[PDB]
Request: fold
Amino acid sequence: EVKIVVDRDPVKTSFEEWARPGHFSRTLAKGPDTTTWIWNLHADAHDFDSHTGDLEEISRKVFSAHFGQLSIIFLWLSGMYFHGARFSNYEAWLSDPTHIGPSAQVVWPIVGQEILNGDVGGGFRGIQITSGFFQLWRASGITSELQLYCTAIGALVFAALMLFAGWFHYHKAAPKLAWFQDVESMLNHHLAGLLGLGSLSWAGHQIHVSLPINQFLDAGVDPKEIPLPHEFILNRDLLAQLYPSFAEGATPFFTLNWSKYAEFLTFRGGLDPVTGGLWLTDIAHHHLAIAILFLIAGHMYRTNWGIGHGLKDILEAHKGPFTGQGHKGLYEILTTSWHAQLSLNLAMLGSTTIVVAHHMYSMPPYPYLATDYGTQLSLFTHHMWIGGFLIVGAAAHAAIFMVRDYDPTTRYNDLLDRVLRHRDAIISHLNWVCIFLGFHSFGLYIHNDTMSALGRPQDMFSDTAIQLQPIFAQWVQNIHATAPGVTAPGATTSTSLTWGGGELVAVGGKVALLPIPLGTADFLVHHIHAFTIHVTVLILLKGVLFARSSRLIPDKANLGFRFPCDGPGRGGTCQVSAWDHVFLGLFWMYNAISVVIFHFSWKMQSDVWGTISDQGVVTHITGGNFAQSSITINGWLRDFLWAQASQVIQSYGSSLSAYGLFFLGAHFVWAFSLMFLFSGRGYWQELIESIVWAHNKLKVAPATQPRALSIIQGRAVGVTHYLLGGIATTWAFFLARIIAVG
Amino acid sequence: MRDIKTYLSVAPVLSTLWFGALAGLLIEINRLFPDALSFPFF
Amino acid sequence: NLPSIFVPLVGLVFPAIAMTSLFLYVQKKK
Amino acid sequence: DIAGLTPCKESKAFAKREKQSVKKLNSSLKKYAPDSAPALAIQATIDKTKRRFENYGKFGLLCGSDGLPHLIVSGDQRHWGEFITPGVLFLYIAGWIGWVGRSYLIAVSGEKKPAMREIIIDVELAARIIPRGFIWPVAAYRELINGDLVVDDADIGY
Amino acid sequence: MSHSVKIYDTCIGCTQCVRACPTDVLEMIPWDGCKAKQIASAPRTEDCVGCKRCESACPTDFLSVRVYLGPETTRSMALSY
Amino acid sequence: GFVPPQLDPSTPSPIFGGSTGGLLRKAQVEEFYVITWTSPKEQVFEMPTGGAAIMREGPNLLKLARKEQCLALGNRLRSKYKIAYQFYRVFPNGEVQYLHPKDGVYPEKVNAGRQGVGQNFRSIGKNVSPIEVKFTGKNSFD
Amino acid sequence: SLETPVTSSPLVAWYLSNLPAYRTAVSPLLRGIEVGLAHGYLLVGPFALTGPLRNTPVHGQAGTLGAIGLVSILSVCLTMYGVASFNEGEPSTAPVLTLTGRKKEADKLQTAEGWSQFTGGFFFGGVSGAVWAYFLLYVLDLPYFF
Ligand code: CLA
Ligand SMILES: CC1=C(/C=C/C(C)=C\C=C\C(C)=C\C=C\C=C(C)/C=C/C=C(C)/C=C/C2=C(C)CCCC2(C)C)C(C)(C)CCC1
Ligand code: SF4
Ligand code: SF4
Reply:
């Protein structure tokens, strides 16, 4: 069956190699005859599958690499907790979080950057932050710098431990194949073990530490004399004072009359007006139910005993009439090629990151989070960016799998075979859908702008003119606002407040959430999003499906994954490798994310965020001009892009001045990218040649023969600089604007 | 041992330490001579 | 006045006849 | 007074800039305890920029019509503490670096594959070649005298 | 005749092009101007697609087989429709 | 030249579902190609334009659009299973032409009998400047 | 090639074979005028209802004349394509083989003169369809919504 088989001490911890670069690649280890060697060295370091031919060694290598990654993550967490401990105003922030700006970074007074340590309130000076740690540290009842300090220490310990574990598992006790390739027990554990018990232990930490101290702070007390956590579990009488049921030990649970615990485990829903956040009772019930669900899920597959399924015994049964034999053998494909798994997991992880970004703003989990505007905004846009990048990586590695490790002779399948057998139909129909959406979602904006600039407003696309109504969205919102009436009696309000029914939650003269109406502008922006997503999918899916062989080049696969072209023959064959398909799709994903985040910023600052008067009149941060100025590109310039770019541009000579400076460098690089994206190579090669002559004239010609970057590396550096410029520009814009006005 | 010496003589780490030392020198000069615009020695 | 006669002609019908004439030409095959 | 630029030892707009700067700094200063280390550093920067304004009002800095220093690089050594002396100093430094690099390369050229020593420097040879900078003006000089600095018709290969 | 191929006496008769010719254009013939006593030949330039992969192989001084471009045709363009 | 053609017959086709990589209007109006080989055993092979299919015993017959795909598949069959092959061209009149070997022996190696179409007996640097030949039909490489 | 139920089925082949563009058992001019009147009845609707004079009591005649103009433009385009691609004594390029394999007479619809008859029929039919849609939309006009 399945056992603990491993091997002993393959590679010794000897520095013999560190002084010899490129030991892994036979060609690289010979020596740098030119300068392209030092590019090619970094370029293929992590390329494990091109260093061997057996999956055992590359599996060991990736097992060690995961430990390296985890060590870096732990070190980052430790740095964060430290800087919170020794360099923040966290205690003053806890004193009253309504109007005290979270700052967690000071700068040394050397070169005039003292102005960076701007006024943040609470007798502190420091660069304001928007990471949003403080809402978490108030949720977990840290409420003391000693806790941050010791947590940073423990994080450092875990980091060193993981680094050790890595070194040991690669060098000394290397796992074997029948361990890795055994996915049944891995699924079994990770379902039951990691996620379930994780959520369970967190529910523990919440019901036994957070809930009481948070309730006390909501009652209003200086956290100095707030009783320490362990003094809430050792002596029961405190929790007894809080929750009568909680003073009944464990009888009401075991004896199946769970309703007694109804006080601290409940299903209220909505938000908590004391902090706008979620009712921690609800989130505790959530984490606990999720723990139980993962535990009961974990027991699916047979591992050693006689019960349970087998991932081979599940696929082959499914075989429909149209497709034929079904998923037979697919189990072998997804167990014999790492790149396949990397692609699948990257896709699912990007999608989950996006849905996390979405669910965050509309249901603020933490307390006093939906009122620190910049934090909410920055979190949402960061998660969106991460999701986009993960998705593109998924597509790229899927293409790499399609090229290298796919083969019908032994890694056969009858499903993917059919899929590839009609690729042309797929790409054609997706292309036509892309054209259709492009037309009927952007030409609408063009028509609206034109009919505006021609003095014919009553022929526009808006509520006051020829009208388009997003009826399905309002239908769903009505349903979600009337569902807690009959369908979900156990709830108290709608699942969130953004559903089109209820009241508004406002703390400290500022609003946090309220109903959200949808106008024709929302219809148009949603169709823009749909179109751009469809085009990115078109690019990447075409790349994957045509990575093997196209009707232009018959044997593309033999030429490898990443090569620049196939010469200028047959009318020119530039950018045919799947690698170049990903190079293209990157820009379109960037554009999709950019327009999405702009739409989000405008919609929030024009319909939700803002301040509330003493009487109750709302005056939003931007005045609520969305439904009347999002329908013209010229509007986007005037109402949003130009106007709300003030705070970044007057930012010189103030605390926010750093956000100003980047706003130029971001643009600059942004420029710079074109120089690599537009030019070619031969020109630069000849220029380098003349420069080498000019040097050689002075007996300075270096033996590391200069060489203009190879084509693929040129495109890579170009796209990297371009993404950097764009993202840094929107980053500076967002931070400066929101943290200045809000 | 000598292997780690030849590794340390590889341009990345040597360059990092050299640049760190140079930057430290410059920032210390700036500390000991704030804003240092002219050459008020001769 | 005269614009109403000429502008529509140099905008639609004269460009149309020019385009169709050049179409016919470039599609010739002797 | 080159083209009428008075030194801000005597101009006024300089005093106005100084006054407004120290004023906004002081107004910012009165939002903490008079002893808090941040307030202390604030007062430190206040006196620091003050003594900067003073130093500028000590070295003949001709000063614009808007209250700003303005260099005078016309060649007159009267205002030379801006270009001439720092220029020749940086030229000395640059010649240092250029000569030491060139000498290192010319030396290490004589090996089996000089690329292996161009990526991984001969830090011993590097250390015993590096401090020669004090010779860069004179040494190269003799080179050009003896014609051992340039080449005539050897272009490729070496 | 759409494109054009040329071969020059710096051919060392190493025979990499033919092995890398995608559409069966080149071949070798008995010569007396190298050890291998064989030189290239292009009697099938009609199907010459135009990719430089052939002359991307010739490891001579500068080159020994050139691919000069010219007009276009239906087969010199990889058309399949 | 004792190197006669083989006059491609009509023999069965490989087992394949038929897919969007087949022929188009071009093949039906201008020209197409047919590759033919004898196989040692029913195995699996990836067609040039999509997916994979199985071959049969004896001689095979596959049709394709352009010569490049045929020759790519032939090189695959020669480097993967060590079998010989031919491919023929067809014209809508009914003509059939024999293209690849032209003697039976690969063009990879020497076989006397081939003429010398397109040689220049001078190094590449000896070519002349377009001004010396302008306003004429001639070009430098001729 | 692939043959899904879409591209291959009794009802779909039946329908596509019954519409005028493939029923070779009729004169090409008649198929042309039939498709013309079809598209004529077709296009009047949105052009009229959503035109730039919809808020005016003339919107009917306006949309109808616009439809007629578009029909005329497309008939011009048809004749132009025909004179471009079809020579005047050369053979046809229509599919002369059916699904079973019955060698079909070369479709006179796919001839220069046949394409000309088709174009003329289409133009006349489009005009008739447009005026018919007008007379049925603005005289006998109760059971509709517009
Ligand atoms: C000590 C080495 C050295 C020396 C003496 C020179 C000398 C020269 N270079 Mg130059 N160069 C060098 C290194 C050097 N270069 C390096 C490493 C690069 C790549 C970054 C270049 C890139 C370069 C370009 C692109 C151009 C020149 C040009 C020139 C000429 C005019 C000066 C100029 O514009 O430079 C400007 C200054 C630079 C480009 C900075 C490069 C100097 C580097 C940073 C010093 C390297 C020192 C060494 C690597 C560190 C090791 C220290 C030691 C312990 C070994 C001049 C002959 C120009 C020319 O053709 O003139 C006709 C020109 O267009 N160089
Ligand atoms: C001093 C010096 C100099 C100069 C320099 C310069 C001029 C520079 C510039 C620069 C520019 C003109 C621009 C720049 C820009 C930059 C940037 C722009 C950066 C960035 C970075 C980063 C790192 C970012 C990041 C991020 C973001 C923000 C987004 C996404 C996320 C993350 C976080 C990634 C000289 C030569 C004299 C000499 C040497 C030294
Ligand atoms: S072009 Fe160069 S590569 Fe393409 S076929 Fe003719 S010779 Fe072989
Ligand atoms: S060119 Fe290079 S490859 Fe072609 S024949 Fe002459 S030597 Fe052999």
User: Anything to note?
Assistant: The beta strands of chain E are 4-7, 27-30, 38-41, 65-68. The first strand of chain E starts at residue 4 and ends at 7. Chains E and C do not touch (no CB pair under 8 Å).
